[PDB]
Amino acid sequence: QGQTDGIYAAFDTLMSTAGVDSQIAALAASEADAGTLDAALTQSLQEAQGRWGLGLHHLRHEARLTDDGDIEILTDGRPSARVSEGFGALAQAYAPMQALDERGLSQWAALGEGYRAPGDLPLAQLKVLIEHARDFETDWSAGRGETFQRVWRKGDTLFVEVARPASAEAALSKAAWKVIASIKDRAFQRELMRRSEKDGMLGALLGARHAGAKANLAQLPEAHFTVQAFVQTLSGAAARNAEEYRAALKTAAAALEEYQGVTTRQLSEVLRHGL
Amino acid sequence: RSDITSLYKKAGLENLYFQGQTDGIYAAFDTLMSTAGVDSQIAALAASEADAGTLDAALTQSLQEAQGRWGLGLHHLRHEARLTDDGDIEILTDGRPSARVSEGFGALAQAYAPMQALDERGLSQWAALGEGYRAPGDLPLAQLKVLIEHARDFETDWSAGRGETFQRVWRKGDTLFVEVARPASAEAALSKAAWKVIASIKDRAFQRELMRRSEKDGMLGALLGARHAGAKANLAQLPEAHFTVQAFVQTLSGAAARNAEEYRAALKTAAAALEEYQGVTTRQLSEVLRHGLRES
């Protein structure tokens, strides 16, 4: 038996947690050769990995269509999960692959086994690496505004990663907190904050019905995946220029804040529409 | 006739050169290796009945070490040597046959020439790590320190070093390679060895005779009683007429390979070893040069 096409909307919804607009349901109606879909699915998955912050830059990520219309997610050519299995299935397939420190930062090297420079490396020395080394990679270091950052290079491309780890459940809940906190009507704010004692911060925002809220509480991809990182890349000459590097670092930090605000804005709109 | 006299003289000198050498293609390879300062003892392995695989490994390891001395600039190629069924030794670069030792040493030099890319200083223009960025060879040590401590595979250009040398450094994986070079043609090396011989003569009369000759024909010609280029032709079959020590590669690994001060120490070690190897010639050639002496 062959499955359905809700699979494509589900994948789009998964991608949206990473800040990626994949438009796979639309491409699916274009009736383009599977090759086109496999290419689009894989491209989107790779962007998503850049932002989820699981720390799997060393793995080969790909997604393909299957004989029964399913979407298969693979790492290093090994199947990890199918979208039809649910979002928790995928995040749980990924979890054993991670190596995290007590801050939630990946301890895997983007370039793989080898030497990594220390995170506290002064800019004066990092500039020498950028200008005159070939491949190199640094460890995490503290950044501005409670972020963490690292840089590495592979071949022609320089990668600047800025991260602020958060569990999906806590990012989601904190987003609901921000929606409630930024209310001007003290009475309405108080009513919502009291409702959350029994319904939860998110359920208090009244997504829909009682069971409908459950449908929007435990199976949501936002409860399994969230934006923890942003990766900004430079190529060619730009990849060996310290000024371009600094600019990319500022860009990555700014983009990180923007993408970590999506859940708050979305829940804010939900509350607006619920009134 | 002049060609028969020359034939006799060349054969006499060759008999003297390979007197005490053991084995045939194996002795030829041992002498080839001795030009690079490598004591390979391949004939000894063959005499001890070692199996063919061991001998192949020995040939290859010795060839690689020698490539680190000859100064050809083929660090980017894989060098192998292997025994063949017809009694030869086949020399390969990147897995492709390039020469056979039975064809002579000038043939080996000719086989390598199309692969070389030497600048006007005699230094190779090829990167040891192949296509890719190379750092300036005159970086401040404070910046080269960063590359040595924290980079992965990196490479610098040649620059002058202390004592009329040239130097560069690169890292491949776990190993830091420190190369010190002072180019010198095989012919110039022969001239220098003959010079050391003449300079060491203690009989002033004979020494001044040799010097007098060295003004018209060369240093080597003075020793061999021959005009220049005649004296060279007499040695054209010997490996010393085609290969000599032009460089020395000192390696560091482990923690020492990310210690800038160990890098600075390795430069001095490599330069010392280079000067030592370039001050002496092969034992065999020395026996040849000192044979046709009247006085001591």
Next chain:
Amino acid sequence: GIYAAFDTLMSTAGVDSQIAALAASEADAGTLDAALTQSLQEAQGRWGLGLHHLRHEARLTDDGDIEILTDGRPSARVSEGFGALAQAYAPMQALDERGLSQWAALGEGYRAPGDLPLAQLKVLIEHARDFETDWSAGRGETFQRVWRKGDTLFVEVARPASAEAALSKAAWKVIASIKDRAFQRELMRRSEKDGMLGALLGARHAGAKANLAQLPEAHFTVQAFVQTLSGAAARNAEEYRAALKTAAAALEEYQGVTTRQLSEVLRHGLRES
């Protein structure tokens, strides 16, 4: 002053220009300019730089200098140093792997093989207008070529040599002739760290090492000799062959003479040290 500097520069080619004496004789500016240009052209025919296609001139300047021109344009002034002269010339040269010039003496056009059958070269010498052969080997490890310009046949024989090598050879002659065993041995030991010349001069340190690089002998040396035939001789192939022998003899002579004179200069400086 400058006149002696020029005479020295000319002596590196075996050319005895005698400019210092001519100026001391109160010769007029024209006579001196003519002598400077004549000597310079003779020297160009022996330095082996390979600039036969360029016109070489030299002339006095008001401020006591000598200006050296190629194709009528200033190339260098003597007061700037001999390394500056060699540097001025270097961009104009095109030396092959043997040190032989790749330029055609006649400029653009066809050049014949240098290994051409002698019976055929005879035809070119007898019946051609302007023609030119490429380089080829000659007698006694020399190289040779020939070309025609109008009524004159030019036969060039070359034995390329490095100026620093000839300078080293002269220093070696001096050391080899020292009659004081202890001192001779001292210099021979010193010549392994410092060079042959550096040891001779005591040039142990920088600055001295740089000063011995400003010698004209460190940049120019006799590498070739050009023999000319004109009139009927310029179309007689046997006269051409004779010219090869004469030019080779002249080259051997000038190389030997200039090295011997350099040796005597260095020895004199040593004794006066």
Next chain:
Amino acid sequence: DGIYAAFDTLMSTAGVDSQIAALAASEADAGTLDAALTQSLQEAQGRWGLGLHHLRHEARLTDDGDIEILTDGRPSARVSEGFGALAQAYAPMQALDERGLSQWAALGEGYRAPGDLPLAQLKVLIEHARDFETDWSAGRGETFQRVWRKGDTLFVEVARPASAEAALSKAAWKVIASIKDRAFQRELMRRSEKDGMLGALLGARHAGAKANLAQLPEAHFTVQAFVQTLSGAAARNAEEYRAALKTAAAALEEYQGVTTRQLSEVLRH
């Protein structure tokens, strides 16, 4: 005002189909017409055998409407002045020897190789020399030949000298041998012993009529030579030269043959 046809008629005597009148009738400008006039003149000079290779040949127009002829930039003749006028302008510049061959060197001042060089030697000059020139040497079939190079072009000239008067006498001969009445033929062939072939056909008086009727350029110019050129690599290939030599000899045969046949029709009509 048939000046353009007159130039075409002059070019006809060299075997040159100049088609100049075709261009003037087509509103060609003075630039292209001067180019056409000069081009045609130059190749005609190659075949007339005048021996003026060392001079620059140029043909420009004037306001009155005539092809002014110039050599080395100096005016020499004008078409409106007649064809014999042109031949007389050229005569003082020529230097023909006792064989009808020019003594002038095509390259001008400088060494000229002797004529009778073995091909083994000439091969060398072709392969390895820069500019060179040879004197005249006899070829096959009572022809004469020489070769010279200038820059990147090799010039191979083959000639069989013949005066215009000889051209006319040969045309008249060929006409007479066409006569199908041996009696009339025998009378004419015998009359020629005192009048010449041309006089035999003139029929009134040789000495006078042959001069009074000298209105056509055929009385002043004919084909004596052919110059074939090679350039680039071909100009140093001994085989290309050898082929060019034979081609030029063949072409000369053809052009003298055609010119004779054309004279036949002119004399028969």
